[PDB]
């Protein structure tokens, strides 16, 4: 299966290795109080634990959690 193996697709949260990680090339610098914002900047990677079908998830980084989409990201998928 999709197992680290043919990319997230359309996917329930979770599904094959689990998470991904996301090379944000284009992002704010927010706080969680701001909806629930990454913090995080252009050259940074996430590791969005939320997965969804249309890039529209939430990311997890080191502590920082919100929700951002595909818009501005460059997915290392897994």
Known sequence: ?????????????????????????QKRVPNAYDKTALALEVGELVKVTKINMSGQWEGECNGKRGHFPFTHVRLLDQ
């Open 1 to 25: 299966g999709p197992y680290a193996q043919p990319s997230i697709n359309t996917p329930l949260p979770n599904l094959q290795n689990g998470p991904f990680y996301a090379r944000v090339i």
